[PDB]
Design an enzyme around this catalytic site. Sequence first.
Site, PDB file in Angstrom:
ATOM      1  N   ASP A  25      -2.625   7.966  11.731  1.00  0.00           N
ATOM      2  CA  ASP A  25      -2.861   7.523  13.092  1.00  0.00           C
ATOM      3  C   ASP A  25      -1.801   7.833  14.040  1.00  0.00           C
ATOM      4  O   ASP A  25      -0.867   7.065  14.186  1.00  0.00           O
ATOM      5  CB  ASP A  25      -3.076   6.026  13.068  1.00  0.00           C
ATOM      6  CG  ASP A  25      -3.821   5.513  14.276  1.00  0.00           C
ATOM      7  OD1 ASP A  25      -4.761   4.724  14.061  1.00  0.00           O
ATOM      8  OD2 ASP A  25      -3.477   5.876  15.423  1.00  0.00           O
ATOM      9  N   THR A  26      -1.984   8.883  14.825  1.00  0.00           N
ATOM     10  CA  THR A  26      -0.975   9.279  15.796  1.00  0.00           C
ATOM     11  C   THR A  26      -0.858   8.362  16.976  1.00  0.00           C
ATOM     12  O   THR A  26       0.069   8.496  17.774  1.00  0.00           O
ATOM     13  CB  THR A  26      -1.216  10.721  16.299  1.00  0.00           C
ATOM     14  OG1 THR A  26      -2.510  10.805  16.917  1.00  0.00           O
ATOM     15  CG2 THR A  26      -1.153  11.701  15.130  1.00  0.00           C
ATOM     16  N   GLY A  27      -1.810   7.446  17.131  1.00  0.00           N
ATOM     17  CA  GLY A  27      -1.771   6.515  18.256  1.00  0.00           C
ATOM     18  C   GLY A  27      -1.039   5.214  17.964  1.00  0.00           C
ATOM     19  O   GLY A  27      -0.664   4.470  18.871  1.00  0.00           O
TER      20      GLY A  27
END
Lengths: 99, 99
Positions: A25-27
């Site tokens: 999850d890059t967020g």
Amino acid sequence: PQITLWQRPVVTIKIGGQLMEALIDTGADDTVLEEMDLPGRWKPKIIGGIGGFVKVRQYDQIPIEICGHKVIGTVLVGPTPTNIIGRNLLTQIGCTLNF
Amino acid sequence: PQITLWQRPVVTIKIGGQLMEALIDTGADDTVLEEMDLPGRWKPKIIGGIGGFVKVRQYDQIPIEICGHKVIGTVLVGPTPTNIIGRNLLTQIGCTLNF
Ligand SMILES: C[C@H]1CC[C@@H](O)[C@H]1NC(=O)[C@H](Cc1ccccc1)C[C@H](O)CN1CCN(C(=O)c2cnc(N3CCN(C)CC3)c(Cl)n2)C[C@H]1C(=O)NC(C)(C)C
């Protein structure tokens, strides 16, 4: 490896001698795993997400093996719908976004 | 380009004739934006974040320009702390993760 987004980017992580799948999850600024007990002790922490805040247990300097790479970092434990691997650990494995 | 995760992976998107900053989120299945009205018609939708469920306005077939590339897809509008580009539009620009 190169992972595409046609599916949820789910990899295998080892933490506490057990294997479990986690989403890339890059967020997420942090790594939040599903409610469990890790070898060590925690502190309380409150994280904000979409639609609310949740109270999680913060475990510091925990050793986790993300796809072969041995890594160490802070992992949060709480009522999350899925095991999430955020930026804090992703930077350590050299993960980049390419397009 | 090649984007690293030390900082938050934020890019510029042009949607509705006006440009704004968004976050590349590989964990978000959908693309959710901060409340505003887009040139189109919406239908109701309830998505869930880590904090809980939330109500959004689902807008279909909206054209966005994620830094150069022109794409088409479903955009959601709701009370989100930040604009996020999920996998539904990321696949279209050819976005992948590599480590
Ligand atoms: C992670 C926290 C750490 C510290 C912050 O960085 C923090 N940030 C975030 O949480 C960021 C947003 C943010 C950005 C900046 C600042 C604040 C917030 C979102 C996050 O990346 C992804 N988040 C992962 C868990 N998750 C699921 O797996 C999931 C998937 N599917 C579900 N279902 C079940 C089957 N149904 C059929 C359908 C609904 C359900 Cl309930 N839940 C929801 C998902 C999410 O938000 N996805 C969208 C489409 C809804 C937007």
